[PDB]
Each structure stands twice: as structure tokens, then as C-alpha cells.
């Protein structure tokens, strides 16, 4: 007879740690990188010169 870990089990709490717990990281880059145009409607037209004499 010896009062093993399974006889004492109800006295033995596991602990918890946040050391490896993180949110998602914001990896997106195109809005930070390229110039942004604020659109007032679904479609916008951009005229460009195509040819010259």
C-alpha cells in the first residue's frame, strides 16, 4: 500500500500558459504600398493617351 499519483489525482491541478498564444498577424501590404483612390461609385473611367503623330 503506498498512496500513488492516481490515489491523489483529485488534488493535482494542471497549469496553463500563454507563452505560445498569439492572434493572427496582419500580413496584407497592397493598401500600404500603392496609392489609394477613394471611389464615390462602383465604376470609374481613366482616360489615357494611346497614340500621337
Amino acid at each position: 500500500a503506498d498512496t500513488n499519483r492516481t490515489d491523489a489525482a483529485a488534488l493535482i491541478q494542471e497549469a496553463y500558459s500563454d507563452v505560445f498564444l498569439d492572434s493572427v498577424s496582419e500580413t496584407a501590404k497592397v493598401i500600404g504600398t500603392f496609392p489609394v483612390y477613394n471611389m464615390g461609385t462602383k465604376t470609374t473611367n481613366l482616360p489615357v493617351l494611346s497614340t500621337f503623330p
Binding site: S17, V19, F20, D22, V24
Partner: protein, 270 residues
Amino acid sequence: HAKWVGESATAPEGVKPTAKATWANKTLVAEELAVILPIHENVLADATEDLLAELARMGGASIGRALDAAVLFGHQKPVTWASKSLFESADDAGQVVAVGNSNGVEGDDISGSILQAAEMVADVYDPSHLLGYSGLRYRLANQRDANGQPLFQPYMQGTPGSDGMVHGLNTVFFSGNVDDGSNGDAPVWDRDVASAIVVDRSRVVIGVRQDITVKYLDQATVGGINLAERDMVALRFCGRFAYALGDNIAQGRVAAENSPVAVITPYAGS
């Protein structure tokens, strides 16, 4: 993940999708390692030296070596430690770099290989430590061109520089022996399997449940020896430790596989 969605009231593309997030669990489990050092009371009396102070130094050092060998290479690792050893993490991730015999015309001399291993860890982590065997300064010096000029620093004049910092990685040197399971020796670091390891230090946790304690025994039965009946004594040493590796940072909808560890392997050819 987001989806590109349309503007219909009834068609399937006019409704927004649902999605989950998921968490998982990793465990530190404390495991015990120990030794008992028995000796005869007459030998303690007749010796010039304090043999109990010497055996007290031997017991503590023996445990620290066995911990290092378990974490780095998985040598006699407890079955309850769910994490991969550092070498096993890199090896399963395929983050393994072989040193070559090219005089650095390949990227594959040891200094080039350290940068390739650093790049592999830097892909999803911050590498910060280089683990190996000592004398690295003498191997960083003496790296040579196909012409025999030095690769590492300008000229041989002042060439064995500091070990302590190498390619922005802090160096750490491992040495000694551990139980081979057959009453011989195995090395803490096997130089035939790895030249060095690159690691992100922050992804390793060493749990210390009980730091090394010494007990003097003068009446116990140990190893089948009845100590007091044989006019003997012993020192008992034990500590309790755990290890976890933060290896698989999430990447998306599927469960990811990564390593914060890369291994550099010696030149195996002729």
C-alpha cells in the same frame, strides 16, 4: 479566409460564406532524471581530497548533460515529451543544409551554409542562436577561395576573431558525454550528424519543476547494496524538467507544419 462575393437576392453568389477559427494544445510534462553515487566510509576517511565534494560536483553536472542531449538530439527523450527534439524538428521539416567541398564556389562552405540555415528559419521565425561544438573561430578563419585567399575576413594577419557572435547569431557550444544505454559513452553533440543548428530561441521552453537536489544517504538500500550494513554511504541526485517547442505557427484554413530550427550537416563525401 475571405471570399469574393456578388450582388444577387436569390442566386448562390449573392450570400456571404461562414467560417471557423481553431485552437490546439501543447504540453510541458515534468520528467525526472537521477543518479546515486555509493562509496565506502573507509575510502572517504583515507582519501586526501574531499571525495563527497567531488561526488557532489559529479552528480549535478551529470544531470545537466543528460538534459541537453535530450532537448537537442532526442537522446533517451522521455516518451511523455510530445515535442520534437531540435534536430528532429529541422530534419522532418526538411530544413537541412549540407556543407560541401567547393572552396566556396558553391554557396556551401560553412559560412555560406549558416546563411542558408538562417534563411530557412527566417522564413516564418526570427533566428538568433547558432548551436554547435567549440573552435568555430578556427573553422571560420581558414575558409578559402579556389585561389587560397581567405573568404571570411581580408587577410590571415589577425584571423581567429571572436566566437561569440556569428552572422548576427549568438553562438552556444555543447560538449561531453551521456548514457549510451549499454554502459559506454554517447556524445552530447554527435559531430558526424550535425556541424551546427540555427534556432529561434523564443520558440523553446524549458520547464524547471525541481532544480537539482542532493540527498546524503547512510542507511538506505541502493542498487541492492544495504549501505549501513556494508559500511558505505551514497549521494542521491535528482531534478525534474520539461520541454516544449512552439513549432507549428498557424498559416490558414489547414493545420500548418513549420520548424523554428535548421540543421547544418558535415561534408560526408571523399
